[PDB]
Amino acid sequence: MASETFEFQAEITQLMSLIINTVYSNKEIFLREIVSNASDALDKIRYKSLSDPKQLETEPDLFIRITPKPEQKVLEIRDSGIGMTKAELINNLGTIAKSGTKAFMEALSAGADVSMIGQFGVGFYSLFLVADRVQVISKSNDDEQYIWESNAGGSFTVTLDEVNERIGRGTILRLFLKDDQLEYLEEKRIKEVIKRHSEFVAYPIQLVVTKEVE
Protein backbone atom coordinates (compact mmCIF):
# COMPACT_ATOMS: atom_id res chain seq x y z
CA MET A 1 0.00 0.00 0.00
CA ALA A 2 2.09 2.83 -1.44
CA SER A 3 2.40 6.36 -0.06
CA GLU A 4 2.23 9.41 -2.30
CA THR A 5 4.55 12.27 -1.41
CA PHE A 6 3.72 15.96 -1.86
CA GLU A 7 5.59 19.23 -1.34
CA PHE A 8 4.21 21.87 1.06
CA GLN A 9 3.45 25.43 -0.22
CA ALA A 10 6.47 27.55 0.52
CA GLU A 11 4.84 29.82 3.14
CA ILE A 12 3.56 26.74 5.08
CA THR A 13 6.96 25.13 5.47
CA GLN A 14 7.96 28.69 6.57
CA LEU A 15 5.03 28.99 9.01
CA MET A 16 5.75 25.52 10.30
CA SER A 17 9.30 26.65 11.03
CA LEU A 18 9.45 28.24 13.35
CA ILE A 19 5.70 28.15 15.07
CA ILE A 20 8.12 25.48 16.20
CA ASN A 21 11.14 27.83 16.40
CA THR A 22 9.88 31.16 17.84
CA VAL A 23 6.99 30.23 20.17
CA TYR A 24 7.75 29.91 23.86
CA SER A 25 4.37 30.53 25.60
CA ASN A 26 0.67 29.61 25.63
CA LYS A 27 1.56 26.33 23.80
CA GLU A 28 -0.98 24.30 25.69
CA ILE A 29 -2.85 26.59 23.22
CA PHE A 30 -2.39 23.78 20.61
CA LEU A 31 -5.37 22.02 22.19
CA ARG A 32 -7.89 24.84 21.78
CA GLU A 33 -6.90 25.08 18.10
CA ILE A 34 -7.60 21.30 17.70
CA VAL A 35 -10.87 21.41 19.46
CA SER A 36 -11.86 24.55 17.56
CA ASN A 37 -11.16 22.81 14.19
CA ALA A 38 -13.04 19.75 15.38
CA SER A 39 -16.00 21.86 16.48
CA ASP A 40 -16.04 23.64 13.10
CA ALA A 41 -15.88 20.28 11.29
CA LEU A 42 -18.80 19.07 13.33
CA ASP A 43 -20.56 22.40 12.59
CA LYS A 44 -20.09 21.59 8.87
CA ILE A 45 -21.57 18.08 8.96
CA ARG A 46 -24.56 19.20 11.03
CA TYR A 47 -25.17 22.15 8.67
CA LYS A 48 -24.86 19.83 5.63
CA SER A 49 -27.18 17.38 7.38
CA LEU A 50 -30.06 19.94 7.42
CA SER A 51 -30.62 19.42 3.65
CA ASP A 52 -28.97 15.99 3.42
CA PRO A 53 -29.83 14.18 6.72
CA LYS A 54 -28.47 10.79 5.56
CA GLN A 55 -24.96 12.25 5.61
CA LEU A 56 -25.19 11.64 9.38
CA GLU A 57 -25.88 7.90 9.09
CA THR A 58 -22.19 6.90 8.69
CA GLU A 59 -21.76 8.10 12.28
CA PRO A 60 -24.88 9.43 14.01
CA ASP A 61 -23.12 10.50 17.19
CA LEU A 62 -21.57 14.00 17.17
CA PHE A 63 -18.58 14.10 19.48
CA ILE A 64 -15.01 15.22 20.08
CA ARG A 65 -12.94 12.48 21.82
CA ILE A 66 -9.40 12.78 23.24
CA THR A 67 -7.41 9.56 23.78
CA PRO A 68 -3.97 9.63 25.38
CA LYS A 69 -1.76 6.69 24.28
CA PRO A 70 1.14 6.88 26.83
CA GLU A 71 2.95 3.74 25.59
CA GLN A 72 3.39 5.33 22.14
CA LYS A 73 3.81 8.91 23.44
CA VAL A 74 0.71 9.74 21.34
CA LEU A 75 -2.32 11.97 21.90
CA GLU A 76 -5.30 11.41 19.51
CA ILE A 77 -8.22 13.86 19.04
CA ARG A 78 -11.08 12.42 17.12
CA ASP A 79 -14.16 14.14 15.82
CA SER A 80 -17.17 12.76 13.94
CA GLY A 81 -17.28 15.88 11.70
CA ILE A 82 -17.45 16.18 7.97
CA GLY A 83 -14.11 14.51 7.26
CA MET A 84 -11.79 15.12 4.29
CA THR A 85 -11.42 13.15 1.02
CA LYS A 86 -7.91 12.44 -0.35
CA ALA A 87 -8.06 15.60 -2.47
CA GLU A 88 -9.27 17.69 0.52
CA LEU A 89 -6.43 16.43 2.72
CA ILE A 90 -3.87 17.37 0.03
CA ASN A 91 -5.45 20.79 -0.53
CA ASN A 92 -6.35 21.75 3.09
CA LEU A 93 -3.24 20.50 4.76
CA GLY A 94 -0.51 21.78 2.62
CA THR A 95 -0.69 22.34 -1.12
CA ILE A 96 -2.99 25.37 -1.42
CA ALA A 97 -2.08 28.90 -0.13
CA LYS A 98 -4.32 29.81 2.97
CA SER A 99 -5.11 33.53 2.80
CA GLY A 100 -3.99 34.24 6.39
CA THR A 101 -0.58 32.47 6.43
CA LYS A 102 1.99 35.10 5.56
CA ALA A 103 0.08 37.71 7.56
CA PHE A 104 0.26 35.53 10.64
CA MET A 105 4.07 35.10 10.37
CA GLU A 106 4.66 38.77 9.68
CA ALA A 107 2.37 39.40 12.65
CA LEU A 108 3.88 36.83 15.08
CA SER A 109 7.24 38.44 14.43
CA ALA A 110 6.02 41.68 16.03
CA GLY A 111 4.75 40.11 19.22
CA ALA A 112 1.36 38.70 18.36
CA ASP A 113 0.28 36.06 21.06
CA VAL A 114 0.12 32.73 19.22
CA SER A 115 -3.46 32.37 20.35
CA MET A 116 -3.97 34.68 17.39
CA ILE A 117 -3.11 31.84 14.97
CA GLY A 118 -6.73 30.77 14.70
CA GLN A 119 -7.87 34.29 13.67
CA PHE A 120 -5.64 33.92 10.61
CA GLY A 121 -7.12 30.48 9.77
CA VAL A 122 -3.91 28.46 10.20
CA GLY A 123 -4.48 27.08 13.70
CA PHE A 124 -3.75 23.48 12.64
CA TYR A 125 -0.02 24.15 12.53
CA SER A 126 0.10 24.99 16.24
CA LEU A 127 0.34 21.19 16.93
CA PHE A 128 4.12 21.45 16.26
CA LEU A 129 4.50 23.21 19.67
CA VAL A 130 4.06 19.81 21.31
CA ALA A 131 4.42 17.25 18.52
CA ASP A 132 7.30 16.48 16.20
CA ARG A 133 5.12 14.37 13.91
CA VAL A 134 1.42 14.16 13.13
CA GLN A 135 -0.84 11.85 11.23
CA VAL A 136 -4.28 13.10 10.18
CA ILE A 137 -6.54 10.11 9.54
CA SER A 138 -9.73 11.10 7.81
CA LYS A 139 -12.92 9.63 6.41
CA SER A 140 -15.39 11.63 4.36
CA ASN A 141 -18.65 10.18 3.23
CA ASP A 142 -17.38 10.83 -0.30
CA ASP A 143 -14.13 8.89 -0.17
CA GLU A 144 -12.15 6.01 1.41
CA GLN A 145 -10.20 6.51 4.72
CA TYR A 146 -6.77 8.13 4.15
CA ILE A 147 -3.75 9.05 6.27
CA TRP A 148 -1.89 12.39 5.83
CA GLU A 149 1.46 12.45 7.64
CA SER A 150 4.08 15.17 8.31
CA ASN A 151 7.17 15.62 10.44
CA ALA A 152 7.40 19.38 9.67
CA GLY A 153 9.97 18.79 6.89
CA GLY A 154 9.22 19.98 3.35
CA SER A 155 7.17 16.97 2.18
CA PHE A 156 4.08 15.11 3.46
CA THR A 157 2.62 11.77 2.47
CA VAL A 158 -0.95 10.62 1.86
CA THR A 159 -1.73 6.90 1.97
CA LEU A 160 -4.94 4.86 1.64
CA ASP A 161 -5.63 3.64 5.19
CA GLU A 162 -5.36 -0.12 5.63
CA VAL A 163 -3.89 0.10 9.17
CA ASN A 164 -6.01 2.15 11.58
CA GLU A 165 -9.42 1.53 13.09
CA ARG A 166 -12.37 2.48 10.87
CA ILE A 167 -13.77 5.84 11.61
CA GLY A 168 -17.42 5.91 10.49
CA ARG A 169 -16.92 9.53 9.47
CA GLY A 170 -14.62 12.32 10.64
CA THR A 171 -11.00 12.86 11.43
CA ILE A 172 -8.42 11.75 13.96
CA LEU A 173 -5.39 13.93 14.70
CA ARG A 174 -2.69 11.65 15.95
CA LEU A 175 0.02 13.69 17.69
CA PHE A 176 3.46 12.16 18.35
CA LEU A 177 4.48 14.16 21.37
CA LYS A 178 7.95 15.58 21.98
CA ASP A 179 9.90 13.81 24.84
CA ASP A 180 9.59 16.98 26.93
CA GLN A 181 5.87 17.32 26.37
CA LEU A 182 4.54 14.05 27.82
CA GLU A 183 2.44 15.98 30.33
CA TYR A 184 -0.36 16.29 27.72
CA LEU A 185 -0.95 12.51 28.15
CA GLU A 186 -2.16 13.20 31.68
CA GLU A 187 -5.83 13.14 32.50
CA LYS A 188 -5.67 16.09 34.96
CA ARG A 189 -3.53 18.22 32.57
CA ILE A 190 -5.96 17.60 29.71
CA LYS A 191 -9.12 18.51 31.68
CA GLU A 192 -7.38 21.62 33.00
CA VAL A 193 -6.45 22.80 29.46
CA ILE A 194 -9.99 22.05 28.15
CA LYS A 195 -11.97 23.90 30.87
CA ARG A 196 -9.90 27.06 30.32
CA HIS A 197 -10.24 27.40 26.55
CA SER A 198 -13.14 25.32 25.31
CA GLU A 199 -16.10 26.32 27.53
CA PHE A 200 -18.65 27.03 24.82
CA VAL A 201 -17.93 24.04 22.79
CA ALA A 202 -21.32 22.78 21.74
CA TYR A 203 -20.40 19.10 21.48
CA PRO A 204 -19.48 16.53 24.17
CA ILE A 205 -15.71 16.47 24.71
CA GLN A 206 -15.01 12.88 25.75
CA LEU A 207 -11.76 11.88 27.50
CA VAL A 208 -10.65 8.26 27.25
CA VAL A 209 -8.91 7.17 30.39
CA THR A 210 -7.24 3.83 31.11
CA LYS A 211 -7.47 2.50 34.70
CA GLU A 212 -5.96 -0.65 36.21
CA VAL A 213 -8.48 -2.77 38.05
CA GLU A 214 -7.08 -3.27 41.59
Collect all residues with Cβ–Cβ distance below 8 Å to 28 and sequence separation of at least 6.
184, 193
Q: Which of residues 145-184 bind a copy of itself (CB under 8 A)?
A: 162-166
Collect all residues with Cβ–Cβ distance below 8 Å to 131 and sequence separation of at least 6.
30, 75, 175, 176, 177, 178, 181
Residue 188 makes contact with a copy of itself by CB under 8 A: no
Residue 202 makes contact with a copy of itself by CB under 8 A: no
Per CB under 8 A, the list member of 178, 189, 191, 197 interacting with a copy of itself is 191
The edge-to-edge listing of strands for the beta sheet with 146-150 is: 4-7, 155-160, 146-150, 131-139, 170-177, 74-79, 64-69
- Looking at the Cβ atoms of 10 and 209, the one nearer to a copy of itself is 209
Residues that bind ligand RDC (CB under 6 A): 34, 37-38, 40-41, 44, 79, 81-84, 92-93, 124, 171, 173
Cite the DSSP H helix spans in 147-199: 187-197
- Looking at the Cβ atoms of 10 and 207, the one nearer to a copy of itself is 207
| Known binding residues for ATP | 33, 37, 79, 84, 92, 98-100, 119-124, 171
